Each structure stands twice: as C-alpha cells, then as structure tokens.
Ligand binder design. Structure first.
Ligand SMILES: CCCNc1cc(-c2ccc3c(ccn3CCCN(C)C)c2)nc(S(C)(=O)=O)n1
Length: 108
C-alpha cells in the first residue's frame, strides 16, 4: 500500500512502544532464547520479535504499512503455531494481537 512518510514513521514508533509496554508483551520483546523454548528454531523458519521490529523501524526498513503489519503478524502466528492453544504464551498472543489491532486502527 501507500509509501510511508516521516509522519507515518512517528505513528509506527508510537504503536511499537505501546506494544512493548504492554503487560503481556514480555515473551515477544526479544528473540526467543533456545533455552526457553525447546526446538524453537527447528520449528519456526521465520522468527520475529519486537526488538527486531524496533531496529527495522529505526533503520526505515519498512516501505509500506503492509510490511510492518506482516512482521507483527509473524510474531503472533509463530507463537500460536509453536505453542498449544491452552498455553499461557498462546494467550499472550491472543491478548497482544487484539491490542495491536486496536492500535493499528487508530494509526492512520
Ligand atoms: C516450553 C515452551 C514455552 N514456549 C514459549 C516460551 C517463550 C519464552 C519463555 C521465557 C521467556 C521469554 C522471554 C523471556 N523469558 C524469560 C527469561 C528466559 N531466559 C533467561 C532468557 C519467552 N516464548 C514463547 S513465544 C515467543 O510466545 O512463542 N513460547
């Protein structure tokens, strides 16, 4: 979709910080440590996390909003694939994705 402006990027920074501050974002703040998730990097071919997204935002990696949404969705999709639906980690993805949607709709 449409090219991101500098003003758009300030809004993306705001959304990212909101996610990083959320009480249920802690499993997603940094790349998964293999010691905390057996076989994680054998299961998940395209890992993603909020620190990697922050680095990409600061580097102006994103050209369009779809690319930012895609990386954010990877975080949630990876979590729900790796973990069972009754896992607390799965629930964190449920809560934080709903929050992301609220914030993304606000973003314009
Ligand atoms: C047994 C299957 C568990 N599945 C998991 C586990 C984790 C996870 C666990 C601990 C964690 C973080 C983040 C910090 N800590 C604590 C510190 C740990 N060390 C010292 C760095 C994530 N994240 C997911 S995830 C990303 O939601 O898919 N799934």
């Amino acid at each position: 979709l449409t090219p991101l402006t500098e003003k758009d990027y300030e809004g993306l920074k705001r959304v990212l910080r909101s996610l990083q501050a959320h009480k249920m974002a802690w499993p997603f703040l940094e790349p998964v440590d293999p010691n905390d998730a057996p076989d994680y990097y054998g299961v998940i071919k395209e890992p993603m996390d909020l620190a990697t997204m922050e680095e990409r935002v600061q580097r102006r990696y994103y050209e369009k909003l779809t690319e930012f949404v895609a990386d954010m969705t990877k975080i949630f999709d990876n979590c729900r694939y790796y973990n069972p639906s009754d896992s607390p980690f799965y629930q964190c993805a449920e809560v934080l994705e709903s929050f992301f949607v609220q914030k993304l709709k606000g973003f314009k």
